[PDB]
Amino acid sequence: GLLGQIAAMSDLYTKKSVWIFGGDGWAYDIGYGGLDHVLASGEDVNVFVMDTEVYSNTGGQSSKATPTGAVAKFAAAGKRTGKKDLARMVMTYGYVYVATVSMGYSKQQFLKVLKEAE
Amino acid sequence: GKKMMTTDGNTATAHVAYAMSEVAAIYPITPSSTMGEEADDWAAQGRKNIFGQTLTIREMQSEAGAAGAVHGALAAGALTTTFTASQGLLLMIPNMYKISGELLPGVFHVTARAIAAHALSIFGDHQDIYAARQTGFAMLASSSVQEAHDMALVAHLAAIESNVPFMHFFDGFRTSHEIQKIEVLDYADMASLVNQKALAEFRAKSMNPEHPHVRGTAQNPDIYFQGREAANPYYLKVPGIVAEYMQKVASLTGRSYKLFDYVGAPDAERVIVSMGSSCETIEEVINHLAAKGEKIGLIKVRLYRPFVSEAFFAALPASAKVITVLDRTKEPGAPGDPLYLDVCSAFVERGEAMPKILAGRYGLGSKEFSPAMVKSVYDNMSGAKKNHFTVGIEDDVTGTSLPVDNAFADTTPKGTIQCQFWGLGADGTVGANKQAIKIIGDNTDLFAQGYFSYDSKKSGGITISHLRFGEKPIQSTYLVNRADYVACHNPAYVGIYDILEGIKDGGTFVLNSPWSSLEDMDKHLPSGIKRTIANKKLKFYNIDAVKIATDVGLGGRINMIMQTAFFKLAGVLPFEKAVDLLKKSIHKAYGKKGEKIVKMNTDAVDQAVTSLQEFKYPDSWKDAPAETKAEPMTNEFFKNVVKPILTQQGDKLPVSAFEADGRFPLGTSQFEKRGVAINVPQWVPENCIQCNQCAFVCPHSAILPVLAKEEELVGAPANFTALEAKGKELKGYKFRIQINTLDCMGCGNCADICPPKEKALVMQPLDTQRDAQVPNLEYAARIPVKSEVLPRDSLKGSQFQEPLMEFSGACSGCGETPYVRVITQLFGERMFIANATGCSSIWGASAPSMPYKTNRLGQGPAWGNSLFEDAAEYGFGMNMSMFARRTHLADLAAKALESDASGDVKEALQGWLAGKNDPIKSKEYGDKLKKLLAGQKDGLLGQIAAMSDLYTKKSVWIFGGDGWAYDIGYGGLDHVLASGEDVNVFVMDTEVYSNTGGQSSKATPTGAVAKFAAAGKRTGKKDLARMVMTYGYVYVATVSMGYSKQQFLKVLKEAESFPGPSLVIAYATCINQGLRKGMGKSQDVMNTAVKSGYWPLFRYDPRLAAQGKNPFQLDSKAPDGSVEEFLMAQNRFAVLDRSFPEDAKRLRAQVAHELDVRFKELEHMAATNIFESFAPAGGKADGSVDFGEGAEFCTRDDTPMMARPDSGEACDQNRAGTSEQQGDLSKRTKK
Amino acid sequence: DSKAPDGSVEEFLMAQNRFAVLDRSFPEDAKRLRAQVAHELDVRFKELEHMAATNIFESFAPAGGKADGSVDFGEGAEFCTRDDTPMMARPDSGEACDQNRAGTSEQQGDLSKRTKK
Amino acid sequence: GKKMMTTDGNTATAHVAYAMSEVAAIYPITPSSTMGEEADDWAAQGRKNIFGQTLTIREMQSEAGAAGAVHGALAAGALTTTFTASQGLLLMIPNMYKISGELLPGVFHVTARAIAAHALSIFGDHQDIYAARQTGFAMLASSSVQEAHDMALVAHLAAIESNVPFMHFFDGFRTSHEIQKIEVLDYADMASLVNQKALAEFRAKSMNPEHPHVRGTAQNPDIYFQGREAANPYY
Amino acid sequence: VITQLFGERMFIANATGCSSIWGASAPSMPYKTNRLGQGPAWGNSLFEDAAEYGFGMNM
Amino acid sequence: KIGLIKVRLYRPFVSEAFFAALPASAKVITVLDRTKEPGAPGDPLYLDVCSAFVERGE
């Protein structure tokens, strides 16, 4: 009974950290609409976007995250449009922790964001 | 244990799903929307599932999102569900492969619905389940409300044990929406059938950081093929597991099932294989025919996947000499449909007898599958043996349909009352019907069935109900044809519709009408009806429900009276129990605001019963004879297609009546003149200040401003009164406000906003107006619209334009139509409209009636609904086509200038080339050219002559509401907008998913009460405007008609002209927001929305940034404390107050704080020196370069994904370090 | 967390082939765009600056309320809140109401207060 | 006329697609990514299609977006294409029904690829084409690089004339990525096989505010079943 | 480092892309458990739905 | 004595043409499918060919 039940749910005792991993092509393009919804849902999940500023894995195709003038696939003369501002875009909600980072610059600030975001 | 219950198939299944689920990721899609909503209300009421917990429901942005959420949950150990249909289902296909791929106990309940091909459909068929045929999910079909409950249970238990997901489907509407008296089960019983060892294992196999594993891996060719076959043992066991559970449940229920089940004669020679609800009706006919000695049978399929041939056969009689497989779908180009294809493979694979299998199709899009049709399927087996036929349609083009004989007898069991009720929307007929079913079914032990035909018209639409009671279970899954009792609750029907079709001899018939005397009665009822009433020997009862209702105090509300007539004259119950049972319910329901209401209802029942006596009639009726057609000119098409459909005779149209690609011509709305407003605004010339705010406001184009110079007003009616025209430019004309009292919904909007104290427009009952205002309208209709006299886009001048969208089947005082009408009053002649699904498409394109029309010149909005999920990317498609086709024209024109073409021709040509993108010059010049190249057919010049529908710049619009723009279609809206190309998106904001049930959208406000936001949304509105304003190159503006019509026009003009993307979000009212004082108060409300600070009006136009000016302009002033008096005026906000004051007072403060912040942020943006500059575009020029040229290190990997045709040249893969590390190294060994 | 731009921009862009190829092969266009990017980061960072300094801003609550209770947007509403469409039809729907065809409340009343009899 | 060329199945087909298309709404998905990229570099190099115009390629946010863009273009009169595989294809299913539903000459070139079930796969098989079996699109398979060129041509011309969209598929990697010495055709020859009466009609049947019509309508049960069978003569 | 901080108790819903390609190409899998047998529960749903997938787990 | 029918036009599936390619001496015929529909009674190509053979009635 009861006590035994709880004994069996031991892989639920300690709070878990739900992460959502993906790059710029997913977060800014194909998966954005969803990224946005989940983020607007206000529940406790953590999304980490690795920004390469293009669709890497498949051929370096230009993504909505690719910068003005960067040369990628379908942006063969250098992208003629600005980077999609996802950060300022989701910062409009007000209830979503939003941060950007760069390892080469501050590893301290990266850790401060990991600790704060989670 | 067991519990009697009288409900539909949806809730029948949502009963079982809530019980067996721990999580539900959801999304609204007709006809399955209910299930998710009930799953949600129940959870909101503390209801516990089998584990004693309330359900976790969450609403996703789309059903693909829901599919993925359902996937992650199962992966994570929770048992999960989802409800979906047609397109929703298609979007869940990718996941479904992953879900069964990873062997998870998912369960999808789908109310099988048709797929949108030439046209869309909310109705029922198997096009969507068959689309998921290969995903790997098991499929189990229920063919009746009782079966939806059981089969849903089977599907859950079997999933848990087998680890193979299950999709349980039932026909959309014909089962999902059929009320029927069934037996349900207690959660404890469902709980008791659960394999715990299996369930505890699902738990351990799951994801968990305490004992992790990786799933989803990418596999090569060496191991993919194997790992794919590794799940076989499971699919081998999923059938026995289903059989095991059909058996266990039967143990508790008494209702037994088999994978495939036979019904009919043991020595039947002609057997039918069906699936879904057709079986019930087929079974019902089988009995009839068999009682007569016929050797016919039926195999109802339950478990469609996996398809156990062994079990198929165990249900097919050995004497079957011919067998036809009925499929509720159409796979264009296959050699046969799925079910038929499956059965065949069994027969060949069996290698013995071969009964001659015939294939047939029925019910697509909820087409009827009545008994006569089944008789026909059968007769075919013994007669012609036409293979690959259709039943239910007259296929005169391909000639594949079976003939149908309606003289076929009635086949319902002995002792069955069949009823039909004809009513007007919102007269409570349907409600009463659902009530009479609970009442009868709960206090008698007769089976009750109820099905309700509706109307595509949102306001004043008709509604016909079909009820059935009988001592035997009702297997009639078809509409009622031989009615015992037919009731007509709206006198207007008698004349227009076929009220008495099929009524049985001596069948009672009641009519709500004030023609109490043989005199009036005689001066209204048509010949056909008096006759019908006569030769068939009917029991005609006339009742003036309106008056008795007014009399007894119920303010002319006929529901309770017409409810009395049923109970009394229906023949289902003995008089004393009938009137007994009725009163007992008057108290249960009611007992609201005390006794008064109650008693006042009781009295209605009384006098209802008292005044309810047979209308006695003259034998003369037997040959009452024919009337004359006071018919107007209506088109060759209205005459032939749109009228027949509107008068409930569309089934009668053969396939040749419809266009292969399903298109429809515009303006069929013009000839409708429903004339259902109760009160219609009437003009008062002596008060009109001549302003054109009334028409500009009419959500249906009911008001028509006439400006006619005096000699056009000659044969004008005596009463065609007109004022002198105020204005400089306006002097030789007389201006009149013409009320179209037959295309008005009597919303009251115009009069309510009409400016003068002594109103110019006043509401008057339709009958004080119509006689005089009908002919005047016509007159005013064949008078020229003064498009050029005033500035097109000036409030007054706009109302002097041809409205290219009129009389939509949208609600009275709808908040969407005023906008879209003026949008066409400004760009109509050259616009493309890509309409996202929602009220826009529903009111804008419900066959046969189409609001949008062409102008005097035959041009108007090219209209098309792609889907719901992709309106923008669809309108981006058109945009691209115009680029290419318009570019072709320009290279061709550019070429003609190098020819021996006329000088004039060349002069038009460069002018055009120079003004291609000017909607003035492009036309000014294209017309010169259209005349100049007239007749031209040879080479270059001829080519350009043929591309004349490309000469003038077109306006590409993308229409959709908040659910599309903020949710399902956002991702796309965003992309198209980021694309920077010239398209215009117009979002009608209702702050919820209107069209389908007022479900909460990501645009719904803090504390607004919608579906899935049942305690008032506990999150802020998604700020789309500020969200897209971050790009910097997208024109973004918000508007509100009630506040500034001038600013609306300034936004239309500015948005359409910005050489690039434009976003226009408009506050739109809705029946769903629940405006306390009426939709007439709509304009006043949009207006309060801006004053209150609730909805501020701004504009972000990048060309200002181009001139060094700040592109952000506020247009609304700071908040003025109206907020609360604004919120508390909409039921959406006020219900939460009534029912959750402590929580509600909190949230209206949240919203009052939010609008206060957003507006303070809107303030220093207007004042910001910092800002995002602008360039329309301008550079590129021929030249391509790969990111890989002249790079030093490798720029690609050894992966097969990066391999390209010209790849493979060597480079530095970075394995040897940095340049300087490579060199400091070389400079450290050298040798 | 980062400080203002320090003119590194071009020496940064010109270091990645993604940006440098366009230079090699489209100098006239490339010199233009690296200026665009140098202008953009200059704007975004100036906007990133007065946000850090803004007194105006969006407040926060993790969540906390609801509690058992469900209510349809249709309760105690005066006019109809649903249509005759088959899409809106629900299990417990069908009770009569004012479909707005007869006008606004006050228009209904000024009318009653104008015939009465 | 004819031209010897030694290439893979992808470019073998992208040769024909660029020639027969006026618009391409696109999205990258292995193994079919090449086609779209070549369609794009070529356009960037002034290359002309059979009408003497360079191709209009645009990259969407997903292939469902590309499916919808492909739909709006055809509706709007332009002949259109798209390249896709496995999941990309599955996302184009809803539109595909609308595309053949409204009888438009679309053409989808898919390098048939496996579907992600227990695991994902970029490799080749017919799990994705068979998934679109019922959308109403015609299907024509090529079984070798030489056949990808021809069959792609057949698929374009037949679409123009029949008004029934075409999906032309070849195995992913085993054909899409197999270099082989083949014989191609000049655009002028492809141009010469085009039914002009059919093409000029595709143009007139199209959307245009000068002569509008409404498509996409919501139909009830009285007329849905019929209007659905109304396209039979075509198939 | 994200795992050097939360590894023992994390769910990872990986969108397709280099993440899943480098993070889960059978037979070789980078992610490991700790001295105690616990580590990141890893799974690639699809490309189009990484977030809504990780929202599923959350639910 | 072995043969092969390479299918070109899979949809629409013209049975008439299917047959016009199958030798009259075919005594056994195996339909190869490059796919796996879990739980169907056979794959698409195989399913199609069958319906032709039964529908042919010889």
Ligand SMILES: Cc1ncc(C[n+]2csc(CCOP(=O)(O)OP(=O)(O)O)c2C)c(N)n1
């Ligand atoms: C539905 C779908 N469409 C297309 C693809 C092909 N694909 C996978 S990787 C890739 C792009 C990867 O994007 P990004 O997030 O930038 O990844 P990274 O740069 O980190 O590799 C795409 C389009 C896919 N897997 N699924």
Ligand SMILES: Cc1ncc(C[n+]2csc(CCOP(=O)(O)OP(=O)(O)O)c2C)c(N)n1
């Ligand atoms: C892919 C898909 N999912 C679900 C639906 C069901 N449906 C159509 S209308 C509706 C919501 C309409 O949204 P909104 O834009 O708010 O429309 P309006 O308020 O203007 O009616 C939905 C979900 C659909 N048509 N297609």
Ligand code: SF4
């Ligand atoms: S009451 Fe409404 S529908 Fe009638 S004319 Fe006025 S605005 Fe139009």
Ligand code: SF4
């Ligand atoms: S709103 Fe009133 S005053 Fe103005 S044009 Fe209409 S009827 Fe006349």
Ligand code: SF4
């Ligand atoms: S938007 Fe609202 S008011 Fe308008 S048609 Fe839709 S449900 Fe009716």
Ligand SMILES: [Ca+2]
């Ligand atoms: Ca967090």
Ligand SMILES: [Ca+2]
């Ligand atoms: Ca524009």
